[PDB]
Copies of this chain bind each other. A is one copy, B any other.
Amino acid sequence: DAAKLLHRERMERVTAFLSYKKISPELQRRILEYFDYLWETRRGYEEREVLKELPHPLRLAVAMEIHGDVIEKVPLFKGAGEDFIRDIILHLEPVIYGPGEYIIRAGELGSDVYFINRGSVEVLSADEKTRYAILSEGQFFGEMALILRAPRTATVRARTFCDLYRLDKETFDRILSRYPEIAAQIQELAVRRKEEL
Bitwise, A85-121 to B at CB < 8 A (1) or not (0) is: 0100000000111100110010101000000000000
Contact residues in B for A45 (Cβ distance below 8 Å): 17, 20
Using CB atoms, name the residue of chain B closest to A1.
B16
**Contact B83 A107, beta carbon cutoff 8 Å:** yes
Copies in the assembly, this chain: 4
Interface residues in A, total, Cβ within 8 A: 44
A52-89: which residues lie under 8 A (CB-CB) from chain B? 53-58, 61-62, 65-66, 83, 86
* Cβ distance A145 to chain B, nearest Cβ, rounded Å: 15
Decide: A14 near B50, CB < 8 A? Known: A23-B62, A107-B83: yes
Q: How far apart sit A65 and B61, CA to CA, in the bound complex (Å)? A: 34
Residues of A contacting B: mostly: helix
Decide: A10 near B53, CB < 8 A? Known: A27-B61, A61-B27, A66-B21: yes
Using CB atoms, name the residue of chain B closest to A60.
B102
List 12 extra interface pairs beyond A14-B54, A23-B62, CB under 8 A: A2-B12, A13-B50, A20-B43, A21-B66, A23-B65, A23-B66, A27-B62, A30-B58, A57-B98, A57-B101, A57-B102, A109-B178
